[PDB]
Amino acid sequence: PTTFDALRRQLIPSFDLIYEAAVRTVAATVPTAPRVLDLGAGTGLLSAAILRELPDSEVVLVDRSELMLTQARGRFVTVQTGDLTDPLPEGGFDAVVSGLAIHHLSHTGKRDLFRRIREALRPGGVFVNVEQVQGPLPHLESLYDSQHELHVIREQAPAHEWAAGRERMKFDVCIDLETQLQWLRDAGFRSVDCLAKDFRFATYAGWV
Ligand SMILES: C[S@@+](CC[C@H](N)C(=O)[O-])C[C@H]1O[C@@H](n2cnc3c(N)ncnc32)[C@H](O)[C@@H]1O
Ligand SMILES: [Ca+2]
């Protein structure tokens, strides 16, 4: 379980910065013993970092991949098979968080999800996205990719893991940060901000 996380740091620029930024944003917002929804939770890496900071948290992990959720169950809290496009779990949440998941939805799916997240959030609640974002112009996307490659080089990520990541990027529907911040505003979030960024990777949030 520590080996994967070590691999994730090799593959993701500023992994600690962007994940911690989300944890700290949540921690500054939510009441003690908060209820948290983790969308596209995977192995539960984001749910874990939040629990470490806020041990009394009630966390609900959602992911369409049973294989991923099994390992999450293994790391650990509720776990649920579900698609991001499906209705969110009921009951309301103090925070909704997501890491490297939402960029797989169509732009129409993202905007609809943003609205449904807003509706799931209790007053004062926060949505935080740790996200892969697109360069706004081709030269910027080339720079973003170059910077990603520089990280993978420096951290000596295994060749096959980088190749697999490259492959999975063919299923991406990334867009630039500014556009999706605007969509947050459009979805009825009171305040939106980018907390942290390292070229292609960014943590942003909206409050209801
Ligand atoms: C790159 S992994 C991120 C895992 C975890 N959130 C993290 O930050 O380490 C993307 C995850 O999103 C999930 N996912 C992608 N599209 C999804 C969808 N439409 N509905 C549900 N889960 C989805 C995948 O199953 C996978 O577990
Ligand atoms: Ca992806």
Residue numbers in the entry: 15 to 90, 96 to 227
Question: Can you provide the manuscript's text about this entry?
Answer:
Here, we characterize the O-methyltransferases BelI and CysG, which catalyze the initial step of β-lactone formation. Employing techniques such as crystallography, computational analysis, mutagenesis, and activity assays, we identified a His-His-Asp (HHD) motif in the active sites of the two enzymes, which is crucial for binding a catalytically active calcium ion. As expected, BelI as well as CysGΔN16 adopt the class I methyltransferase Rossmann fold, characterized by a core domain of a seven-stranded β-sheet flanked by α-helices. The HHD-motif enables regiospecific C1-carboxy group methylation of their respective malic substrates.
The crystal structures of CysGΔN16 in complex with S-adenosylhomocysteine (SAH) and BelI bound to SAM were solved at 1.5 Å and 1.95 Å, respectively. The 2Fo-Fc electron density maps depict the cofactors at atomic resolution and illustrate similar interactions with protein residues of either BelI or CysG. Intriguingly, the crystal structures of CysGΔN16 and BelI revealed a His122-His123-Asp191 (HHD) motif with additional strong positive electron density, indicative of a divalent metal ion. Molecular analysis indicates that a flexible N-terminus in both enzymes likely plays a key role in substrate binding. Furthermore, phenylalanine in BelI and tyrosine in CysG, at position 18, act as gatekeepers (see below) and can either adopt an open or closed conformation important for catalysis.
